[PDB]
Structures are given as structure tokens and as C-alpha cells.
Amino acid sequence: VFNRPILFDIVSRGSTADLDGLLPFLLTHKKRLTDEEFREPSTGKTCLPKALLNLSNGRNDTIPVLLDIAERTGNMREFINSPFRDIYYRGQTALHIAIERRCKHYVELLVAQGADVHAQARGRFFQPKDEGGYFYFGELPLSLAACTNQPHIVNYLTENPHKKADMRRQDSRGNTVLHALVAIADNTRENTKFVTKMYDLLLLKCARLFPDSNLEAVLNNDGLSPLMMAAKTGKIGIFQHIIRREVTDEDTRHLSRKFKDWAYGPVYSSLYDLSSLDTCGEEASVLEILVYNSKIENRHEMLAVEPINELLRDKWRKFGAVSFYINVVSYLCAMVIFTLTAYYQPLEGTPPYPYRTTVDYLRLAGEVITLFTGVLFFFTNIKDLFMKKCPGVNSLFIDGSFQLLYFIYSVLVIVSAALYLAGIEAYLAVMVFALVLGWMNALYFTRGLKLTGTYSIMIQKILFKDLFRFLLVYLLFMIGYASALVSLLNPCANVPTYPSCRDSETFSTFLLDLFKLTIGMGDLEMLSSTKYPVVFIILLVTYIILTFVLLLNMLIALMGETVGQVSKESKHIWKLQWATTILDIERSFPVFLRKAFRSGEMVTVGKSSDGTPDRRWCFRVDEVNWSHWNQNLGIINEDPGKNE
Ligand SMILES: CCCCCC/C=C/CCCCCCCC(=O)O[C@H](COC(=O)CCCCCCCCCCC/C=C/CCCCCCCC)COP(=O)(O)OCC[N+](C)(C)C
Ligand SMILES: CCCCCC/C=C/CCCCCCCC(=O)O[C@H](COC(=O)CCCCCCCCCCC/C=C\CCCCCCCC)COP(=O)(O)OCC[N+](C)(C)C
Ligand SMILES: CCCCCC/C=C\CCCCCCCC(=O)O[C@H](COC(=O)CCCCCCCCCCC/C=C/CCCCCCCC)COP(=O)(O)OCC[N+](C)(C)C
Ligand SMILES: CCCCCC/C=C\CCCCCCCC(=O)O[C@H](COC(=O)CCCCCCCCCCC/C=C\CCCCCCCC)COP(=O)(O)OCC[N+](C)(C)C
Numbered sequence: 001v002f003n004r005p006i007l008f009d010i011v012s013r014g015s016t017a018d019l020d021g022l023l024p025f026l027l028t029h030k031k032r033l034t035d036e037e038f039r040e041p042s043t044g045k046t047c048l049p050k051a052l053l054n055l056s057n058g059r060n061d062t063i064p065v066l067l068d069i070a071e072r073t074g075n076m077r078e079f080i081n082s083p084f085r086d087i088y089y090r091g092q093t094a095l096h097i098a099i100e101r102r103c104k105h106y107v108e109l110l111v112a113q114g115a116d117v118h119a120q121a122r123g124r125f126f127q128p129k130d131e132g133g134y135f136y137f138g139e140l141p142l143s144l145a146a147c148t149n150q151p152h153i154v155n156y157l158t159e160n161p162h163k164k165a166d167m168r169r170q171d172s173r174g175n176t177v178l179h180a181l182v183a184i185a186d187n188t189r190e191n192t193k194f195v196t197k198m199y200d201l202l203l204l205k206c207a208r209l210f211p212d213s214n215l216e217a218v219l220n221n222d223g224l225s226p227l228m229m230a231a232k233t234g235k236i237g238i239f240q241h242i243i244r245r246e247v248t249d250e251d252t253r254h255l256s257r258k259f260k261d262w263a264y265g266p267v268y269s270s271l272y273d274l275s276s277l278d279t280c281g282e283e284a285s286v287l288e289i290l291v292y293n294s295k296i297e298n299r300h301e302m303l304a305v306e307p308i309n310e311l312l313r314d315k316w317r318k319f320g321a322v323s324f325y326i327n328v329v330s331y332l333c334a335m336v337i338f339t340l341t342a343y344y345q346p347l348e349g350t351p352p353y354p355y356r357t358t359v360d361y362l363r364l365a366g367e368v369i370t371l372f373t374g375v376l377f378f379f380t381n382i383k384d385l386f387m388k389k390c391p392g393v394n395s396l397f398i399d400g401s402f403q404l405l406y407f408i409y410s411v412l413v414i415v416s417a418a419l420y421l422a423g424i425e426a427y428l429a430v431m432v433f434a435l436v437l438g439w440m441n442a443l444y445f446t447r448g449l450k451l452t453g454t455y456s457i458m459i460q461k462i463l464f465k466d467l468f469r470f471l472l473v474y475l476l477f478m479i480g481y482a483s484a485l486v487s488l489l490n491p492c493a494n495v496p497t498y499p500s501c502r503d504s505e506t507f508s509t510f511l512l513d514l515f516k517l518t519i520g521m522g523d524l525e526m527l528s529s530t531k532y533p534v535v536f537i538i539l540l541v542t543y544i545i546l547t548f549v550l551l552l553n554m555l556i557a558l559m560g561e562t563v564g565q566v567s568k569e570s571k572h573i574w575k576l577q578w579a580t581t582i583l584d585i586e587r588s589f590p591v592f593l594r595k596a597f598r599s600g601e602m603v604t605v606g607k608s609s610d611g612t613p614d615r616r617w618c619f620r621v622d623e624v625n626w627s628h629w630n631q632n633l634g635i636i637n638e639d640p641g642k643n644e
């Protein structure tokens, strides 16, 4: 009377008037609502999911009934819990369905019987949009309700009579509720609204509940926290909100990262928490994540917030400026040292090994210092291949290209030294390409000034969305005419004189004469040796119009369309270049020296409810406001000033 297909029409239909009869039929035959001849063969779906999917205006009258019949045969902690055993909805239960349908009345019901509030929806659907899934809320019903802008259940699953969902529970990746809100978040307006609210709501609620380590400290199975997870994923709206977290109620002020050290009239000093941002060596940091392994589309907005920008300038003036300007002079000299050898490198015989003088020993000092630079830039770039390297190289204006070019320069100094030692005499030609790269690799060191650093990246953008497009067509106009005009010149079999005639290098030299014409440093050198002389000049004049008057001047005009558009991008890319420069210098120091150039200070920011004073390494920011007069919230230092 009640087989599989007939019921799943009923509970789908929502008619609680023909299923009066399951009990006398589901008791004498000794069946159960959780059998294999009663669930769909593919997923594992049951009456109780099917009801909530087929929900009539927020009300399916069958769920109060089926669980009554479930009890009188007997199952609640096996019926409600029954997960879909698919590889695609794995772990999903009726409760995961009761909240996504946004039905609160039954979440009370499903929890009233004590179903589960930590079942983990591990399916390929319940997977981020980086694996082959759609919607990753975490994996828990609590993490779901928070990640769907549904506060009242997020309260309920915490504050209810029956079994409570704690916030400390990790999903299969370590990610708690707050790790998950950073995952579902985007940097839109309405998303960042409830993300921050439900973010706030919980770590406040974690403190009134378990009075211990904040939930925001709970790392995951990658090693990251919600703040370091926002930095890696590019979530500004929450990333901002964490760093400027002012909590006023003194029971939870310890969940703050912006403080108010003092406020005399309309001037106050704000004091930021650099607990994770600037950790000198020991811990993983927010600042090394934004700058190295993050999303380049939003780093400039994540580095252009509270203390980060002030924090990098506070590193540049200490050590970042100086050490950089020792890196530049040491490189320029190394290229002087590499210049002098090539100018005093002899050019007779086998590769000129014999030195036998003082000057030739001074040259040898230049070749040994040189080969060091090559192998140095070799090893430093190969260890980078095992460590930081491999973004979208050479379309990446944050040392993506220069890493590639110093690697080339590293090869050619090793090749040239191989051939200079293997006896081949073309050490020079390879060495000559190395020399020119290296002086062009001194554009690397234009980061110490917004002027020249903004300059060396426009060069690289006007070399992409600009003069390669030109090289394309210009090679079509040029091969077209170069083949067309040499087709008119008569061979030298006809007889010895090239510049009138055609033989065997005509094309080659003639391209150069056409390359000179477009740019202007050539002469037409009009020729009567051709068989049709008038048609020849019809074609040169079209080359000169369609290449100097039309393209090479349009080439100037496209740059103007570029440098007006990529200027704002270029100021933002420099701030990454500049920052990546600092953290590389800093990272190269030992920990005791980083810990000597700390950007901050210990401050007694409050008591940790045990009398333990909270000694956080922090960063001051003087600020002024002639409108926010009631600055009487968190005045740590009642005596305003720093009183040095
Ligand atoms: C940029 C190019 C990319 C595609 C590859 C195109 C290659 C172009 C080079 C053309 C070489 C010349 C070959 C034809 C002419 C020639 O030489 O003909 C002959 C025979 O040739 C040779 O014996 C070989 C000599 C050259 C070898 C080294 C080239 C190395 C080029 C490397 C590529 C350049 C970029 C490298 C950087 C890569 C990374 C960048 C980032 C990429 C983005 C990530 C004459 O020679 P000769 O020695 O005089 O022989 C004597 C013959 N006799 C007279 C005695 C009978
Ligand atoms: C204190 C605030 C000062 C503010 C005022 C301004 C001061 C500026 C001083 C600048 C110092 C840095 C410049 C020196 C050269 C330098 O650092 O060259 C670096 C590397 O050099 C070293 O490895 C040498 C080891 C020793 C260095 C420090 C010596 C200075 C110490 C004295 C300063 C004062 C503090 C401590 C002294 C100890 C006692 C405790 C203090 C507290 C009181 C007792 C060059 O970079 P490179 O690796 O080539 O680039 C990275 C390459 N990559 C990763 C990008 C590929
Ligand atoms: C990925 C990097 C690795 C590169 C791969 C290529 C490496 C090695 C090739 C060298 C071996 C070939 C020569 C051996 C045979 C020989 O000996 O051949 C010679 C002539 O050979 C040459 O001239 C070889 C020219 C080499 C240059 C290649 C390109 C180098 C790299 C190019 C890329 C970098 C660009 C920079 C430019 C800046 C602009 C853009 C910047 C970027 C944009 C801003 C024959 O004459 P002969 O006197 O008889 O020789 C002596 C022979 N004897 C009599 C002793 C037996
Ligand atoms: C108050 C501060 C007290 C400290 C004072 C200074 C102390 C020590 C100075 C030590 C000098 C050597 C430091 C080397 C640092 C270094 O390794 O630099 C490298 C640069 O390559 C080299 O150096 C090549 C290696 C061979 C050495 C140089 C040539 C031989 C020695 C010359 C020394 C003489 C100097 C100058 C004489 C002329 C003077 C005119 C003044 C004028 C003042 C205006 C940093 O490249 P990287 O960051 O890794 O970026 C590369 C790109 N990539 C890989 C990251 C993408």
C-alpha cells in the first residue's frame, strides 16, 4: 500500500490526509522508515528531506506526523540523522535542509528531539568554488545559518534548551564559523554587511560563553586564522573590520584591535594591535600573506588601510630605505665591474686566458666577482622556485618579470664562463647580452621612489598593451612590401654591384632600409635599377604614410590612452613593489635583528579578567576630529600625551 514511489508523491504533495494508515501498515509488517527499500537508491533521500524540499509557503504539515510514526516503530536519532550517502550531498541531513529553506519553526522541532547540530556536509556540492562545488558555508548547521544571514537560529543553536552547537567545532578543514564567513564573503555592499554582523555576534558570544582563548585564534588545517584567511582570499570588508575592531563593554574589550590611548580635546591617539601583522620571525603574519601569496586584484586596497601603510613607512625609514640603497650601489658597481672587463677583454686567438700582468689580474677580479653575481642570482632564483615564485610570470609587475630576467643574466654569465673556459670564442656574444640585461635590470632598483618605480612599470605596460601590437602589424606591412619591392628588382645574373641589383642578401638589407624609413633615420634612396620604377615609389610612399604618419604616430597616441589609464594602477603596483622590497629585506635579517627594528611597543591595554595585564605590541596613530567630541570610551592613559 505504501511503497517507495507512492509516498514520495504524498509528502511532496503535502497532503496529511491519505498517509493516515502508515502506522497500522508500518507496524504489523515490521518495516522502518529508514530502510533501503524505502529510500531513493542514488542519494539516500527520506520522507523528512523530501517534505522540506517540497515546502508549501513555509509550512509542510507532514513532518510532525512522520516523526510520530517514526517513534511508534521507534527511531529519531536514526531517522532525522540519516545522511545522503552520495559523493555529492555527503553528510547532508534534514537540519541542513531546514535552515537553507529558512524555516525556523522546524529547526526547533528537529533539535527538540536532539537530532544533530554538528553533522558535516562534506559533499562535492558542499565544497568551495575552487574544487568543483558551489557553496561552502563551512560544513555545520551553525556555520550555515551564519553564512546565510539568518541570525535567530544562530542564537537558537547556541542558546536553546536542548543540545547546543558550540562555535569551536571545526569542519573537515579546520574552518570554524568565522573561517567560513570569510569564505562566503565577497567585497560587495550587502555581503560585507551581514558578514561583519554575524562575525561580531559570535566572537562576542564566544566570550560570554567559554571565557578562554578567543575563537578568532583557532587556526585551521592549513595553519591560518580568519584574519590571515581574509588576506589570502582578498576579503577587504571583513579584513578592515577586524583590524579596526573597537569593543567598548569592558567584559569584551580584550576582543579589540583599535584602542584609544588618550584623547585631549579634539586630538586623540589610536593604538593598533600588531599581534599577527608584524611578528618578527616566529609566527605566520598577515603582512607577509598580503604581500606575497594573495590576490593581486585587492592587495593595494588591503595595504591601504589602518596601520599597514604607516607600518611599512615605519620599516622603510629604519632599514628598508638604507639597505635598499646599499643594494643599488652594490649592483651598479657590479655592472661597472662587469663593464670594465668586457672593454678590457682581449680579442685575439683562443679565448684570451693569458693574463700575465697586473691589469689583467685586475680584470680577473672583475670576472670572478662577476661569476659570483651570476651563480648568486642563480641560486637565489632556484630556491625561490622551491619557495616564493610562480605567479603569472612576466605579466606580473611585482618582480614577476625581473625574477625571469635575473635568471637569464644568471645563465649567460655561466654559459659565457663555460665557453671562455671550454675554449669556444663566443663567450663574448653571450656576455654582451648579459651586460645589457643587467643595466636594464637596474630598473629593478627604481622602487625607492614613486617617480621612477611608476616609470619602470609603465615601460612594461606600454610594452604589452602597446608596442607588441605594433610589432605584429608592422611585420605584416613590412614583409608585404619587402617581398613586393624586391620582387621588382632584377637579379645579378641579369652584374657584380648589389646596391643597384638583387642577389642573395637583398631581402635582408632591404628590411633594415625599411625599418629605418618608418622611424625616420633612413633615406628613400630611390632606385632606377628596378624594371618598373614608378610603381616602386607608389609603394614606398604608402609604407611611409601607413607606418610613420599613421602607425608610429598612432603608436604615440595609444600610449597617451595607456598612461592615463594605467597611472592609477601604476601607483598601486608600486606600493606592492615597494612593500615586497621591505619584507624581503626584513625577511633576510635574523630574528634578533628584526626584533630590534620592531615597529611598535608594549602597552598595558587592559586586564584579562584574571588580573593579568594584556601586554600587546601596538602602533600609535595620532588623529584629529572636531565633531566626535564624546571620546570618553577607552582612555587607557588618563594622562594625555606620551609624557616622554
Ligand atoms: C626570443 C626568441 C624565442 C624563440 C627562439 C628563437 C631563436 C632565435 C635565435 C636565432 C639564432 C640563429 C639561428 C639561425 C642563424 C644561424 O646562426 O645560422 C647558422 C647556424 O647557427 C648556429 O650554428 C647557431 C648559432 C646561434 C646559437 C645560439 C642561439 C640561441 C637563441 C636562444 C633564444 C633567444 C632568447 C633567449 C631567452 C629565452 C627566454 C625569454 C623569455 C621567454 C618568456 C618566458 C650560422 O651560425 P654560426 O654559429 O655562425 O654557424 C657557422 C656556420 N658556418 C658558416 C661555419 C657554415
Ligand atoms: C633602531 C632604529 C634605527 C632607526 C634609525 C635609522 C637606522 C638605520 C640603520 C640601518 C641598518 C641596516 C643597514 C646595514 C646593512 C644591511 O642591513 O645590509 C643588508 C644585509 O646586511 C646584513 O645581512 C648584514 C648584517 C648586519 C646588518 C645591520 C647592521 C646595522 C646595526 C646597527 C643599527 C642599530 C640597530 C641594532 C644594532 C644592535 C644593537 C641593538 C639595538 C638596540 C640598542 C642596544 C642588505 O640587504 P640584502 O640582504 O642584500 O637584501 C635582501 C635581498 N633580497 C631578499 C631582497 C633578495
Ligand atoms: C633563457 C636564457 C638562456 C639563453 C639561451 C642561449 C644560450 C646560449 C647560446 C650560445 C651558444 C651559441 C654559440 C656557439 C657557437 C659559436 O661559436 O657561434 C659563433 C657565433 O655565435 C654567436 O654569436 C652566438 C650568440 C649567442 C646569443 C644567444 C642569445 C642569448 C640570450 C638572448 C636573450 C636575452 C637578450 C638580451 C638582449 C636585450 C634586449 C631584450 C631584453 C628584454 C626586454 C627588455 C660563431 O662565430 P665564431 O667566432 O666562429 O665562434 C667561435 C667558434 N670557434 C671558432 C671557436 C669554434
Ligand atoms: C649606516 C649603514 C652602515 C652600513 C654601511 C655599508 C656596509 C656594507 C656594504 C657592503 C657592500 C656589499 C653588499 C652586497 C649586497 C647585495 O647582495 O646586493 C645585491 C646586489 O648584487 C650585488 O651586490 C652583487 C654581488 C656582489 C657584490 C657587489 C659588487 C662587488 C662589491 C662592490 C662594493 C663596493 C660598493 C660601493 C663603492 C662605491 C661607493 C659610492 C657611494 C655613492 C653614494 C651616493 C642585492 O640584490 P637583491 O636585493 O638580491 O636584488 C636582486 C634582484 N632579485 C634577485 C631580488 C630579483
Ligand SMILES: CCCCCC/C=C\CCCCCCCC(=O)O[C@H](COC(=O)CCCCCCCCCCC/C=C\CCCCCCCC)COP(=O)(O)OCC[N+](C)(C)C
Binding pocket: 328, 442, 443, 445, 446, 447, 448, 449, 450, 451, 452
Ligand atoms: C637607478 C636607481 C634608482 C635611483 C633613484 C634615485 C634618483 C634620484 C634622486 C632624486 C631624489 C628626489 C626625488 C623626489 C621628487 C619629488 O618628490 O617630486 C618631484 C620633483 O622632482 C625633482 O625635483 C627631481 C630632482 C630634480 C633635480 C635633478 C637632479 C637631482 C639628483 C641629484 C643630482 C644629479 C645630477 C648630476 C650628478 C652630478 C654628480 C657628478 C657627476 C658629473 C660628471 C663628473 C615632482 O613632484 P611631485 O609631482 O609631487 O612628485 C610625485 C611623487 N611624490 C611627491 C609623491 C613623492
Ligand SMILES: CCCCCC/C=C\CCCCCCCC(=O)O[C@H](COC(=O)CCCCCCCCCCC/C=C\CCCCCCCC)COP(=O)(O)OCC[N+](C)(C)C
Binding pocket: 472, 475, 476, 479, 491, 502, 503, 504, 505, 507
Ligand atoms: C603560422 C605561420 C608559419 C609559417 C612559417 C613559414 C616560414 C618560413 C619557411 C619558408 C622559408 C624557407 C627558406 C627560403 C629559401 C631560401 O633558402 O632562400 C634564401 C633567401 O632567404 C630566404 O628566402 C629567407 C627569408 C624569407 C623569404 C620569404 C619568406 C618570408 C617568411 C616570413 C614568415 C612570416 C611569419 C609570420 C607572419 C608575421 C606575423 C606573426 C604571425 C601571426 C601571429 C603570431 C636563398 O635565396 P637565394 O638562393 O639567393 O634566392 C635568389 C633567387 N633568384 C635571384 C635566383 C631569383
Ligand SMILES: CCCCCC/C=C\CCCCCCCC(=O)O[C@H](COC(=O)CCCCCCCCCCC/C=C\CCCCCCCC)COP(=O)(O)OCC[N+](C)(C)C
Binding pocket: 532, 533, 534, 535, 538, 541, 542, 545, 546
Ligand atoms: C591606396 C594606395 C595605393 C594606390 C595605388 C593605385 C594607383 C596607382 C598605381 C598605378 C600606377 C601606374 C603607373 C604607370 C605604369 C608604370 O610604372 O610605368 C612606367 C613609367 O610610368 C610612367 O611614366 C607613369 C607616369 C607617372 C604617373 C604615375 C601614376 C600617378 C602618380 C600619382 C599617384 C597618386 C595615387 C596614389 C599614391 C599615394 C598613396 C597614398 C594614399 C594612402 C595610402 C593608404 C614604365 O616605364 P616606361 O614607360 O618604360 O618609362 C617611361 C618612358 N620612357 C621615356 C622610358 C620611354
Ligand code: NA
Binding pocket: 556, 557, 560
Ligand atoms: Na599625445
